[PDB]
Fold this protein.
Amino acid sequence: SWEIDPKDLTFLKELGTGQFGVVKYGKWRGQYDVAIKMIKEGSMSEDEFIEEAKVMMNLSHEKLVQLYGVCTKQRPIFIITEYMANGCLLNYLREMRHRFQTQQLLEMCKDVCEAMEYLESKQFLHRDLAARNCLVNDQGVVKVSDFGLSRYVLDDEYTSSVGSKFPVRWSPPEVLMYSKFSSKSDIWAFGVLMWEIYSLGKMPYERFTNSETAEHIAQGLRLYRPHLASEKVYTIMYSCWHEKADERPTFKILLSNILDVMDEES
Ligand SMILES: Cc1c(-c2nc3nccc(-c4ccc5c(c4)CCC[C@@H]5NC(=O)c4nc(C(C)(C)C)no4)c3[nH]2)cnn1C(C)C
C-alpha cells in the first residue's frame, strides 16, 4: 500500500535541496503532479522512517501535505508527496509583490492551525514547525510539510540543541534548556510562525545570534508586534510564548481564537 513503483515517475524540475538532499517535481503515470524527495545516503534513519511511513500514510487533512507513498527497493529511497506549485511559505512571504492583506495573513495562520489541530488530535508532533516547513499551492492555501521527519535525521548539527542547524529561534525555554519536546513546543513554534507570517518572512530575533536568542528568551525577552499585526492578532501569537508550557493554549483553542479574530476584523 505504501510502495510506489519508481518507474511510474517522470522527473521534470529541481525544487531545492534540504536536510535529506534534493527534492524534485515530477509526474506520476504521466499525469499527476508529485514532489519527490531523493533521500541522500547517510542522511536518514531509513528503516525507522519506512516503518513510520505506514503511520504517516494514514494522516490525512486538507492543510497537511499528503504523503502518497515511498520507493524503498533501491537507494536512494524516494518519498512521494503532494506537489505545491507556489513553493515554500517563507519565500512566498518574502516576495513583496503579493502585498498581502491582513485577512490573507490571518487565513495563512488558520490553514496551519487547522493542520496542527489535526496532528494534535493524533498526538503527533511536527517538531520543526516554521515558515520554511510550510508550502503554498496554486490557490494560495498553506499546508504543513515534513511533520515528524526530524526523528529520522542523522545529522548532529540539526539535532543537537547547540548545533548549527537546530531551530533555536522556534524553540521554547524548556527545549533550549532540557530538550523537552511536547505538544507545547509545537505551540511555541506556531506562535513564532504566526510572527513570521505577519512579518513577511523576516528572521525572528534578526539582530541576535542563536546563542544570544537562547539567553534572551531564558531571561523573558519575547518577539514583539509585527507592523501588520493587530493587537488582537498579537495577543494570539504572544499566548504561545508563556514561559510555563502548561499555560500555553492547545491548537483547538488557538483555532477558536483565530476564527474569533477573523469575525472581528474583516
Ligand atoms: C521550492 C518550490 C516548490 C516546491 N513545491 C513543493 N511541493 C512539495 C514539496 C516541496 C519541498 C518540500 C521540502 C523541501 C523542498 C521542497 C526543497 C527544499 C528542501 C525542503 N525540505 C526538506 O526536503 C526537508 N526538510 C525536512 C526537515 C525534517 C528538516 C523539516 N525534511 O525534508 C516543494 N517545493 C515549488 N516551487 N518552488 C520554488 C519556486 C523552486
